């Protein structure tokens, strides 16, 4: 099924396994999830009996509240087994992006960073950004895998499916 919940207290029973997706607006979150399924609020899609994908509201005096809710989810959700943080390869690692990774790492949650719109950069610049984010990510001291992603060219889709299969198994 497909569900939408107003807050964490309304999420379905905290049992089984789920993987969350997060990122600023226009990071390709929806487009990325569409490569996994064909099916503000927190949207959930159950891909199996007790296996769900969670789409956390984009974080793109008023934001303090919403940013706090994101951290509470990462810290309290017992069934959370991984976090996918999507960021545009042209402007990755913004303060909020780094905050989500740090929070995940402190809650012992594995992380997968997807540098989206990878097709927007030439081979040379694309590789340069990937290497930069990989080096930068070592500063978190966690389990942070980084991969380039392109919804248009369907690049990085298999890597995403493989990461998920590992976390779901």
From Swiss-Prot:
Family label: Belongs to the TRAFAC class TrmE-Era-EngA-EngB-Septin-like GTPase superfamily. EngB GTPase family.
GO cellular component terms, A-Z: cytosol
Positions with a binding annotation for Mg(2+): 30
Record protein name field: Probable GTP-binding protein EngB
UniProt keyword DNA-binding present: no
Gene Ontology MF terms in the entry: GTP binding; metal ion binding
InterPro entries reported in the protein's UniProt record: G_ENGB_dom, GTP-bd, GTP-bd_ribosome_bio_YsxC, P-loop_NTPase
The EngB-type G domain, residue ranges: 15-169
Cofactor list: Mg(2+)
Any one GO biological process: division septum assembly
Organism per entry: Escherichia coli (strain K12)
Residues reported to bind GTP: 23-30, 55-58, 116-119, 149-151
Entry keyword annotation includes Magnesium: yes
Gene encoding the protein: engB
Protein function: Necessary for normal cell division and for the maintenance of normal septation. Depletion of this protein leads to a severe reduction in growth rate and to extensive filamentation, with a block beyond the stage of segregation. Essential for bacteria survival.
UniProt-listed PANTHER family: ENGB-TYPE G DOMAIN-CONTAINING PROTEIN, MSS1/TRME-RELATED GTP-BINDING PROTEIN
Alphabetical UniProt keywords: Cell cycle, Cell division, GTP-binding, Magnesium, Metal-binding, Nucleotide-binding, Septation
């Amino acid at each position: 099924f497909v569900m939408s919940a107003p807050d964490i207290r309304h999420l379905p029973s905290d049992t089984g396994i789920e993987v969350a997706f997060a990122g600023r607006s226009n990071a390709g979150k929806s487009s990325a999830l569409n490569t996994l399924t064909n099916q503000q609020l927190i949207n959930l899609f159950e891909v199996a009996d007790g296996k769900r994908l969670v789409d956390l509201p984009g974080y793109g005096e008023m934001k303090r509240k919403w940013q706090r809710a994101l951290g509470e989810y990462l810290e309290k959700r017992q069934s959370l087994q991984g976090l996918v943080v999507l960021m545009d390869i042209r402007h990755p690692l913004k303060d909020l992006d780094q905050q989500m990774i740090e929070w995940a790492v402190d809650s012992n949650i594995a992380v997968l960073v997807l540098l989206t719109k990878a097709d927007k950069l030439a081979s040379g610049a694309r590789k340069a950004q990937l290497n930069m984010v990989r080096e930068a990510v070592l500063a978190f001291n966690g389990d942070v895998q980084v991969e380039t992603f392109s919804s248009l060219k369907k690049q990085g889709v298999d890597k995403l499916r493989q990461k998920l299969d590992t976390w779901f198994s």
